[PDB]
Design a protein around this nucleic acid. Sequence first.
DNA 1: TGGAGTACAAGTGTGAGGAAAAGTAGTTGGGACGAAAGCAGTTGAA
Length: 57
Amino acid sequence: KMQYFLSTGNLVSQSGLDLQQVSGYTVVAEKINFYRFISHFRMVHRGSFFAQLKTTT
DNA sequence: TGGAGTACAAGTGTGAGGAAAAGTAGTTGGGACGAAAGCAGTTGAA
C-alpha cells in the first residue's frame, strides 16, 4: 500500500491528513541531464489546490 | 550273547527377515490533474 502511494501519488486515507489535495504527491525523477535531476530535490510546490484559482496573489 | 531304550548328526519343509531410493504424509511460508458563467423554461407562493 505504500508502494501504491509512491507509484501513483494518489493519497488514500480514511482520516484525511491535514492536506488539501489527494493527488500529485509524487513525481518521476527524470534523468534527461543532471540539471533536471538535481533540481527535483530543490523544488517546492505551493499546492495543487492553488493551480485552479484565477487570483495571481 | 540277542534286545530295550536313545543322543548325535545326516537330512527335509515352513516364512521372516534385510535393505534402499523412490514416492507421499502435515505444518509453515507465501501469491495478488476538475469546489466553471449568466440564464431559461418550469415553478415557488402571493
